[PDB]
Structure 1
Amino acid sequence: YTRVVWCAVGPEEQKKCQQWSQQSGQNVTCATASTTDDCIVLVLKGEADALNLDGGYIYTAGKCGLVPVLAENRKSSKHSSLDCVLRPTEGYLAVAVVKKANEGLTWNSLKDKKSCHTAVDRTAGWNIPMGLIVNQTGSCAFDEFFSQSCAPGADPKSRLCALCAGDDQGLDKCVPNSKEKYYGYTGAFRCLAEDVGDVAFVKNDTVWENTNGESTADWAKNLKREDFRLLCLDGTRKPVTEAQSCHLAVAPNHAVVSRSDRAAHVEQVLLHQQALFGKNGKNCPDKFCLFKSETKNLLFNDNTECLAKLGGRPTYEEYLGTEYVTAIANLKKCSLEACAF
């Protein structure tokens, strides 16, 4: 009864959740799903209590009645005096990244190039870029803009999946979990880094966390920030240090969602779990760090300082903000009220 059930997406997050469970003395327990969507369903059904979601997915969840509870918060210079849990959430930047070596490639020369997406329905990896591409294009046939792509979640036999690779064996191609080589913020960036795609739609933080020896993963080891560039909307290319004047949009933080009739009990049990396994907990270094998964963003983004109270009891539209909610609406008519389930 004072026990939360977490939904994990893919085998790798189940292994992280079970590990969390053991350390929690069953205060927390796990359910597994092959995708975020089924995870949401499990939550509607009541078979699981919560998960942490990217904005794009929250939108979905919110039509189905789920509610944002706590948000991911990361480090900052502004607001310093404030404790992380109470500090407001700053947001994150969706940027388009390309190889410097790849000269002359601008936002305007994107037609027919190869693209790398975090996964379909996500904010930075999908909703923003295609939103804009649709708008500028007048067409809804965004499935034809890029000659080939890796957009996890799309029809595997489509070209949107042409660039995805599956796991060790090439099984599970294009599934939207971390089983797919190019899935998620990291996969997407790995996709470009290895020159599979010409372009990767990921957040700003991702370029910085995988270059200049920040990641140590064999494909990330030798990567150098200066070999990358950002695509601006004025069709101009800037270094990755100019994110603030060359981004596609600022996204709302990933956050934990739950059923409204459970939000209270999830919030409660969670803040206490963060006291223990969070950035500065009784047991982080030593036994288990909720926000570490080694460059993999499992359960939570790896750069999370803490999970923050929301303050102002946000309904999801409010949490996502009117700007973003519209950009999502206009995109969805291509392919306005429901529970997609």
Structure 2
Amino acid sequence: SVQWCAVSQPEATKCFQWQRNMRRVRGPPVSCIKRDSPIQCIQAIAENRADAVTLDGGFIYEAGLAPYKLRPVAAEVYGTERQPRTHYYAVAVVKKGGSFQLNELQGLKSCHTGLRRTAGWNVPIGTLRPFLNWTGPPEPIEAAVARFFSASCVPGADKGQFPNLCRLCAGTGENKCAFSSQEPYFSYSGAFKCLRDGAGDVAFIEESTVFEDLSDEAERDEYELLCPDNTRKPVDKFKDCHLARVPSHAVVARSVNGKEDAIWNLLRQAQEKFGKDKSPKFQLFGSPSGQKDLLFKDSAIGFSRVPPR
């Protein structure tokens, strides 16, 4: 069977429920393996301890490098069944009423989904590069960001080398600034909560986050986006106001003996049986109260296969 790699107990738990349900409906079998970080899972898959894992774009390049050499086999699909899309938007969310624009963020507080992730780090820092006063290697980019923002929460950052990059995180004790759900400000929802609670002045997340977390349209009106043309616009205008349009998270696997065809068969059948509003028993794209993005993004509605190689 296809062995899936989880990066936490909540994921492992969902993975076992997935296995039990696939069995129940006589569908393709799936097995589970528990690890602790995206990288550990990359390793497991490289040495045949696992077969697949879903990763944010920022980790795709890494996993594709040696020795690992893993490649994407299926991409998450977002939007609606009506208008499917294999991309999402990296946006900058701020509270309505401020006057500062994208070029005036020096000294403020920031909330990021996590270190090395696309919408939360790679795109934002790449955009702010000209304001960072970064000399370049051998200086870590984190040092330049640490002295740009007053304080922030960047899960995964080295609390010892860059103390203020972890200062705004709300994790408890040793789980503070952790690159996992043990840190409340981790991932899209986590970063957005970091803004809502008032810890930060800007959240670097995706366009659908504000609509998922805040159902009441009245509440969404107290948030704005920072557009790269140094203007501010409503949250529903992300298409004319984003930092970048980025490729969706993807399921990766070994380019050699990757069981790519099995993995695709598992996903196509899982999507059809347990996709959006498909089953009251199990949701492939959902999580129990208090959890977010377990295995796959909660905003995903299906999968799209990547071209043969």
The TM-score with structure 2 as length reference comes to: 0.87
Contact 2:78–2:88 (Cα < 8 Å) also in 1: no
Q: Give the equivalent residue in structure 2 for 1:333.
A: none
User: Matched residues in 1 for 2:233 and 2:158: separation?
Assistant: 34
% same residue? 44
1:146 counterpart letter in structure 2: F
What SS does structure 1 have at the residue aligned with 2:181?
Answer: coil
Give CA-to-partner distance per residue, 1:242-293, whole Å, 9 cap, x none. Answer: 211110000101111111221232222322222222236xxx4232111111
Alignment of 1:189-208 (within 5 A): 189-208=192-211
Q: Give the equivalent residue in structure 2 for 1:150.
A: 153
Pick aligned residue for 2:114 from 111, 116, 119? 119
1:55 counterpart letter in structure 2: G
Q: Give the equivalent residue in structure 2 for 1:270.
A: 267
Bigger mean CA offset, 178-187 vs 286-295: 286-295
Aligned: 1:68 with 2:79? no
Bigger mean CA offset, 294-303 vs 65-74: 294-303
Q: Give the equivalent residue in structure 1 for 2:87.
A: 91
Unpaired runs of at least 5, structure 2: 135-140
Pick aligned residue for 1:245 from 234, 240, 258? 240
Pick aligned residue for 1:293 from 284, 287, 290? 287
Pick aligned residue for 1:42 from 30, 41, 44? 44
2:19 counterpart letter in structure 1: S
2:196 counterpart letter in structure 1: A
Q: Could you tell me how far 1:33 is from its partner in structure 2? A: 1.8
What SS does structure 2 have at the residue aligned with 1:266?
Answer: helix
Q: Give the equivalent residue in structure 2 for 1:13.
A: 11
The TM-score with structure 1 as length reference comes to: 0.79
Contact 2:78–2:87 (Cα < 8 Å) also in 1: no
**Cα–Cα, structure 1 residues 135 and 45, in superposed 2: closer, same or farther, change >3 Å?**
farther
Q: Could you tell me how far 1:136 is from its partner in structure 2? A: 4.1
User: Matched residues in 2 for 1:48 and 1:37: separation?
Assistant: 13
**Cα–Cα, structure 1 residues 246 and 75, in superposed 2: closer, same or farther, change >3 Å?**
closer
2:248 counterpart letter in structure 1: N
Contact 2:81–2:301 (Cα < 8 Å) also in 1: no
2:125 counterpart letter in structure 1: M
What SS does structure 1 have at the residue aligned with 2:12?
Answer: helix
Give CA-to-partner distance per residue, 1:183-211, whole Å, 9 cap, x none. Answer: 01110000101111111000111112111
Q: Give the equivalent residue in structure 2 for 1:110.
A: 105
Contact 1:133–1:142 (Cα < 8 Å) also in 2: no
RMSD: 2.0
**Cα–Cα, structure 1 residues 48 and 127, in superposed 2: closer, same or farther, change >3 Å?**
same
Unpaired runs of at least 5, structure 1: 81-86, 215-222, 315-341
User: Matched residues in 2 for 1:18 and 1:160: separation?
Assistant: 35
Q: Give the equivalent residue in structure 1 for 2:304.
A: 308
Q: Could you tell me how far 1:42 is from its partner in structure 2? A: 1.3
Contact 1:134–1:142 (Cα < 8 Å) also in 2: no
State the number of aligned residues. 289
